[PDB]
Amino acid sequence: ARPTVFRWTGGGKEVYLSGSFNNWSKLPMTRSQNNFVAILDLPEGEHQYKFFVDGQWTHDPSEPIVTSQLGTVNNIIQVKKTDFEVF
Numbered sequence: 047a048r049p050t051v052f053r054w055t056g057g058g059k060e061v062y063l064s065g066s067f068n069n070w071s072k073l074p075m076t077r078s079q080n081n082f083v084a085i086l087d088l089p090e091g092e093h094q095y096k097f098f099v100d101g102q103w104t105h106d107p108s109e110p111i112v113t114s115q116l117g118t119v120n121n122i123i124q125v126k127k128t129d130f131e132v133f
Protein backbone atom coordinates (compact mmCIF):
# COMPACT_ATOMS: atom_id res chain seq x y z
CA ALA A 47 0.00 0.00 0.00
CA ARG A 48 1.08 3.62 -0.77
CA PRO A 49 0.40 6.68 1.36
CA THR A 50 -2.34 8.61 -0.45
CA VAL A 51 -3.76 12.01 0.42
CA PHE A 52 -7.36 13.18 -0.01
CA ARG A 53 -8.09 16.86 0.06
CA TRP A 54 -11.52 18.48 0.18
CA THR A 55 -11.39 22.13 -0.94
CA GLY A 56 -15.16 22.84 -1.22
CA GLY A 57 -15.62 24.30 2.27
CA GLY A 58 -17.81 23.29 5.20
CA LYS A 59 -17.34 22.83 8.93
CA GLU A 60 -17.12 19.05 9.29
CA VAL A 61 -16.22 16.58 6.55
CA TYR A 62 -15.91 12.81 6.40
CA LEU A 63 -14.29 10.70 3.70
CA SER A 64 -16.18 7.61 2.58
CA GLY A 65 -14.97 5.15 -0.03
CA SER A 66 -14.61 1.64 -1.34
CA PHE A 67 -11.33 1.47 0.62
CA ASN A 68 -13.11 1.87 4.01
CA ASN A 69 -16.22 -0.13 3.10
CA TRP A 70 -18.15 3.17 2.85
CA SER A 71 -17.69 4.18 6.44
CA LYS A 72 -17.13 7.81 7.37
CA LEU A 73 -13.56 8.83 8.20
CA PRO A 74 -13.23 12.17 9.95
CA MET A 75 -11.07 14.57 7.92
CA THR A 76 -8.58 16.94 9.50
CA ARG A 77 -9.10 20.68 9.10
CA SER A 78 -6.01 22.16 7.49
CA GLN A 79 -5.41 25.50 5.70
CA ASN A 80 -9.19 26.08 5.26
CA ASN A 81 -9.44 22.63 3.65
CA PHE A 82 -9.92 19.08 4.93
CA VAL A 83 -7.36 16.35 4.61
CA ALA A 84 -7.04 12.62 5.23
CA ILE A 85 -4.12 10.30 4.63
CA LEU A 86 -4.49 6.53 3.97
CA ASP A 87 -2.23 3.76 2.84
CA LEU A 88 -3.97 2.37 -0.24
CA PRO A 89 -3.12 -0.39 -2.70
CA GLU A 90 -2.31 0.60 -6.28
CA GLY A 91 -5.34 0.61 -8.54
CA GLU A 92 -8.85 1.98 -8.65
CA HIS A 93 -10.73 3.57 -5.71
CA GLN A 94 -14.15 5.17 -5.47
CA TYR A 95 -14.98 7.72 -2.82
CA LYS A 96 -17.20 10.65 -1.86
CA PHE A 97 -17.50 13.26 0.88
CA PHE A 98 -19.99 13.71 3.67
CA VAL A 99 -19.96 17.48 4.13
CA ASP A 100 -21.97 18.97 7.00
CA GLY A 101 -24.46 16.12 6.80
CA GLN A 102 -24.74 16.01 2.97
CA TRP A 103 -23.25 13.54 0.47
CA THR A 104 -21.16 15.43 -2.11
CA HIS A 105 -18.56 14.63 -4.73
CA ASP A 106 -15.54 16.69 -5.84
CA PRO A 107 -16.26 18.19 -9.30
CA SER A 108 -12.52 18.48 -9.96
CA GLU A 109 -11.80 14.73 -9.88
CA PRO A 110 -13.22 12.14 -12.27
CA ILE A 111 -16.62 10.68 -11.49
CA VAL A 112 -18.54 7.51 -12.19
CA THR A 113 -22.04 6.22 -11.51
CA SER A 114 -22.10 3.36 -9.00
CA GLN A 115 -24.22 0.24 -9.17
CA LEU A 116 -26.43 1.85 -6.51
CA GLY A 117 -27.19 4.69 -8.98
CA THR A 118 -25.09 7.30 -7.20
CA VAL A 119 -22.17 9.48 -8.22
CA ASN A 120 -18.71 8.71 -6.82
CA ASN A 121 -15.30 10.15 -7.46
CA ILE A 122 -12.92 7.62 -9.00
CA ILE A 123 -9.16 7.83 -8.83
CA GLN A 124 -6.24 5.52 -9.52
CA VAL A 125 -3.41 5.09 -7.01
CA LYS A 126 -0.17 4.60 -8.82
CA LYS A 127 3.55 4.89 -7.94
CA THR A 128 3.62 8.18 -6.07
CA ASP A 129 3.82 8.37 -2.24
CA PHE A 130 1.54 11.12 -0.92
CA GLU A 131 -0.13 11.89 -4.22
CA VAL A 132 -3.04 14.19 -3.59
CA PHE A 133 -6.55 13.50 -4.84
Ligand SMILES: OC[C@H]1O[C@@H]2O[C@H]3[C@H](O)[C@@H](O)[C@@H](O[C@H]4[C@H](O)[C@@H](O)[C@@H](O[C@H]5[C@H](O)[C@@H](O)[C@@H](O[C@H]6[C@H](O)[C@@H](O)[C@@H](O[C@H]7[C@H](O)[C@@H](O)[C@@H](O[C@H]8[C@H](O)[C@@H](O)[C@@H](O[C@H]1[C@H](O)[C@H]2O)O[C@@H]8CO)O[C@@H]7CO)O[C@@H]6CO)O[C@@H]5CO)O[C@@H]4CO)O[C@@H]3CO
Pocket residue numbers: 070096103114115116117118119120
Ligand atom coordinates in the same frame (compact mmCIF):
# COMPACT_ATOMS: atom_id res chain seq x y z
O1 LIG B 1 -23.67 2.97 1.44
C1 LIG B 1 -22.78 2.54 0.38
C2 LIG B 1 -22.74 3.62 -0.71
O2 LIG B 1 -22.50 4.97 -0.24
C3 LIG B 1 -22.54 6.04 -1.19
O3 LIG B 1 -23.94 6.19 -1.52
C4 LIG B 1 -24.58 7.33 -0.97
C5 LIG B 1 -24.86 8.37 -2.05
O4 LIG B 1 -23.69 8.93 -2.59
C6 LIG B 1 -25.93 9.40 -1.74
O5 LIG B 1 -26.34 10.15 -2.90
C7 LIG B 1 -27.11 8.84 -1.02
O6 LIG B 1 -27.73 7.98 -2.02
C8 LIG B 1 -29.12 8.18 -2.18
C9 LIG B 1 -29.45 8.54 -3.61
O7 LIG B 1 -28.95 9.80 -3.95
C10 LIG B 1 -30.90 8.40 -3.98
O8 LIG B 1 -31.11 8.50 -5.38
C11 LIG B 1 -31.59 7.19 -3.40
O9 LIG B 1 -31.03 6.07 -4.10
C12 LIG B 1 -31.97 5.36 -4.92
C13 LIG B 1 -31.44 5.18 -6.33
O10 LIG B 1 -31.51 6.41 -7.01
C14 LIG B 1 -32.03 4.03 -7.15
O11 LIG B 1 -31.19 3.65 -8.25
C15 LIG B 1 -32.48 2.82 -6.36
O12 LIG B 1 -31.30 2.07 -6.14
C16 LIG B 1 -31.45 0.71 -6.45
C17 LIG B 1 -30.50 0.33 -7.56
O13 LIG B 1 -30.82 0.93 -8.80
C18 LIG B 1 -30.16 -1.12 -7.67
O14 LIG B 1 -29.09 -1.34 -8.55
C19 LIG B 1 -29.98 -1.84 -6.36
O15 LIG B 1 -28.71 -1.36 -5.83
C20 LIG B 1 -27.88 -2.40 -5.33
C21 LIG B 1 -26.62 -2.52 -6.18
O16 LIG B 1 -26.88 -3.09 -7.47
C22 LIG B 1 -25.44 -3.16 -5.49
O17 LIG B 1 -24.21 -3.06 -6.23
C23 LIG B 1 -25.27 -2.82 -4.02
O18 LIG B 1 -24.88 -1.40 -3.97
C24 LIG B 1 -23.58 -1.19 -3.47
C25 LIG B 1 -22.80 -0.32 -4.44
O19 LIG B 1 -22.52 -1.00 -5.64
C26 LIG B 1 -21.60 0.34 -3.86
O20 LIG B 1 -21.12 1.36 -4.73
C27 LIG B 1 -21.77 0.87 -2.46
O21 LIG B 1 -22.62 2.00 -2.57
C28 LIG B 1 -22.10 3.21 -2.03
C29 LIG B 1 -22.15 4.31 -3.05
O22 LIG B 1 -21.48 3.99 -4.25
C30 LIG B 1 -21.89 5.72 -2.51
O23 LIG B 1 -22.16 6.74 -3.44
O24 LIG B 1 -22.46 0.01 -1.55
C31 LIG B 1 -23.61 -0.70 -2.03
C32 LIG B 1 -24.01 -1.80 -1.03
O25 LIG B 1 -24.45 -1.14 0.13
O26 LIG B 1 -26.46 -2.81 -3.25
C33 LIG B 1 -27.67 -2.25 -3.81
C34 LIG B 1 -28.87 -2.71 -2.98
O27 LIG B 1 -28.88 -1.93 -1.79
O28 LIG B 1 -30.92 -1.50 -5.35
C35 LIG B 1 -31.35 -0.15 -5.19
C36 LIG B 1 -32.62 -0.11 -4.35
O29 LIG B 1 -32.28 -0.46 -3.01
O30 LIG B 1 -33.00 3.04 -5.06
C37 LIG B 1 -32.51 4.12 -4.22
C38 LIG B 1 -33.58 4.49 -3.19
O31 LIG B 1 -33.01 4.36 -1.92
O32 LIG B 1 -31.28 6.92 -2.05
C39 LIG B 1 -29.92 7.01 -1.62
C40 LIG B 1 -29.82 6.87 -0.11
O33 LIG B 1 -30.21 5.56 0.25
O34 LIG B 1 -26.77 7.94 0.03
C41 LIG B 1 -25.82 6.93 -0.18
C42 LIG B 1 -25.52 6.22 1.13
O35 LIG B 1 -26.76 5.68 1.59
